[PDB]
Write a protein that binds this ligand. Structure first.
Ligand SMILES: [Zn+2]
Lengths: 37, 103, 262, 125, 46
């Protein structure tokens, strides 16, 4: 499940981060992923 | 007598080049033998992301990006110079690595 | 250092106890309570990587087979840890039901529980969640009047926080037979919140007190109004005068006035 | 030997405060099994138990005691039950009735250590 | 009764320090149960 919002769904299980796409899009800027292009 | 190789990795080129020029000029101003800051290709890590969040409208696509730059400098110095330089050069954003072996 | 036999056998049994869900527990895991050093052996099994089932069943086994100090060491070093870990790392920040029933199996020995679970919990960053949950644990489980009175008298001497007042409220809602010294600690607790005009106040004197403090004061004044002296009753009716509630203040005052001194 | 009132009362209060310390065995069976394992640090036997059979078995091990077997007699059954939490629970305002015990063992002293030492050493005479 | 147990509740860290100072013993196989390695051998043979 997504280690942020109790969600079985949306999971980005890649690289061992396991945040669903909705929360990972928000935490993207704090993780290191920024908008270039 | 230690022959050491240093490798930096960073996303912000200003801090990385600050640390690089610092180590360069600080290594030559007290007389050391070195190979200048060699520059590995900036790898651009991209992530494909669908435009559609809610299932309304057709499917079109987008892209996110990150630029990762890596440098390396080779040196020959004792134990104390390496310890002190490693402690003094520590910066945020820039990740430094000090390897001793030459195999 | 331990024998490599113990290392490999209990790393094997520690790989068993990761996925175990039913049937019988391993034979090497049920002979650990009988060990003079069960704590060097229980670590090889890797305590934090058991399944919730093994948490519940090892709680049963070790709190029913060890002594009071050993049950305390166990509930403190493994159960409290896994409790806080599953509340903290989960995502609705909830607790599994087997870890829960395990806490309910650690409150069968109230001395081991209180000294090893409750007290090192409240003094190490006990937030509102862990105390909603552990407060539910204590609110559900029947505990002897002596260990309940002693745990109450410990929670009273604790720095004020809404969870600890939840706990004190819960142990006062028990309505058991407290010794006169426990009721003394209660009156001293509910006394320390009044404003001394002679020049000696802390933060408890002028702070905002929740619904839970007036409810705990109400239940205290409801059950133990005949077990306080005249002096302590005057100090408490004074705390009612100064730090009283809109609806509960008059009823606490009425519950202190309708009582006979000892 | 000759039992005094001070001895019996100090004994029942020893059962009372070592009861809280979670260190009693209340009953004929639990106290005999307490004495078979070497767990009884002091045993209390009632002087008014009607059937003498189990007592005629405990009076054969009372007249010839082991190196780890000290005993001592009380006066009544219902009261030795009372001080063990059984029999009666009577405090200044509160009351609750149960049935009384025949014999009770002290496995863990705790809050009555020097008292059970005194009680066991005065029974040595 | 009470004075005995509250000194154990309020000072449980100090009483744990004193119980762990008086009654700590390192892992000894011959001071466990003597039929314990019989059970280590009985489980490890399946
Ligand atoms: Zn999420």
């Amino acid at each position: 499940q997504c280690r942020v919002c109790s969600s079985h769904t949306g999971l980005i299980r890649k690289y061992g981060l396991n945040i669903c796409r909705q929360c990972f899009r928000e935490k993207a800027n704090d993780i290191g992923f920024n908008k270039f292009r | 007598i230690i022959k050491i190789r240093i490798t930096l990795t960073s996303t912000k080129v200003k801090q990385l080049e600050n640390v690089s020029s610092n180590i360069v000029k600080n290594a030559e101003q007290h007389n050391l033998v070195k190979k200048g800051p060699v520059r590995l290709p900036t790898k651009v890590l991209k992530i494909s992301t669908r435009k559609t969040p809610n299932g309304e409208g057709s499917k079109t696509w987008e892209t996110y990006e990150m630029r990762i730059h890596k440098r390396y400098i080779d040196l020959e110095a004792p134990v104390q110079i390496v310890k002190r330089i490693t402690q003094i050069t520590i910066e945020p954003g820039v990740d430094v690595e000090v390897v001793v072996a030459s195999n | 250092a331990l024998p490599e036999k113990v290392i490999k056998a209990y790393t094997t049994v520690g790989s068993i106890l990761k996925t175990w869900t039913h049937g019988k527990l391993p034979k090497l895991f049920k002979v650990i309570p009988s060990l003079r050093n069960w704590q060097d052996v229980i670590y090889v099994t890797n305590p934090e990587e058991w399944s919730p089932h093994v948490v519940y069943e090892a709680t049963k086994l070790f709190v029913s087979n060890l002594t009071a100090k050993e049950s305390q060491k166990f509930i403190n070093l493994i159960l409290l840890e896994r409790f806080r870990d599953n509340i903290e790392t989960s995502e609705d920040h909830s607790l599994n039901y087997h870890i829960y029933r395990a806490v309910k199996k650690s409150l069968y020995k109230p001395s081991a529980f209180f000294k090893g679970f409750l007290f090192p919990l409240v003094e190490t960053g006990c937030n509102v969640r862990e105390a909603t949950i552990a407060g539910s644990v204590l609110a559900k489980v029947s505990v002897p009047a002596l260990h309940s009175s002693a745990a109450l008298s410990y929670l009273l001497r604790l720095p004020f926080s809404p969870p600890t007042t939840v706990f004190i409220k819960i142990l006062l809602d028990k309505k058991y037979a407290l010794p006169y010294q426990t009721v003394d600690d209660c009156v001293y607790y509910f006394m320390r919140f009044r404003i001394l005009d002679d020049g000696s106040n802390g933060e408890d004197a002028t702070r905002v007190l929740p619904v839970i403090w007036h409810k705990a004061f109400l239940t205290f004044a409801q059950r133990y109004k005949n077990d306080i002296t005249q002096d302590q009753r005057d100090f408490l009716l004074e705390t009612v005068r100064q730090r009283g509630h809109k609806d509960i203040g008059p009823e606490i005052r009425r519950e202190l006035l309708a009582g006979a001194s000892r | 030997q000759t039992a005094e009132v001070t001895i019996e009362d100090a004994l029942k209060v020893v059962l009372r405060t070592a009861l809280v310390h979670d260190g009693l065995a209340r009953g004929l069976r639990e106290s005999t099994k307490a004495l078979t394992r070497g767990e009884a640090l002091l045993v209390v036997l009632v002087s008014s138990v009607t059937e003498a059979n189990i007592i005629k078995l405990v009076e054969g091990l009372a007249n010839d005691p082991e190196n780890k077997v000290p005993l001592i007699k009380v006066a009544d059954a219902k009261q030795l039950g009372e001080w063990a939490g059984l029999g009666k629970i009577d405090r200044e305002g509160n009351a609750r009735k149960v049935v009384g015990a025949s014999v009770v063992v002290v496995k863990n002293w705790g809050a009555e250590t020097d008292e059970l030492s005194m009680i066991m050493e005065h029974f040595s005479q | 009764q009470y004075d005995q147990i509250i000194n154990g509740y309020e000072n449980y860290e100090e009483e744990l320090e004193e119980d762990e100072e008086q009654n700590y013993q390192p892992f000894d196989m011959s001071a466990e149960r003597s039929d314990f390695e019989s059970m280590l051998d009985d489980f490890l043979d399946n």
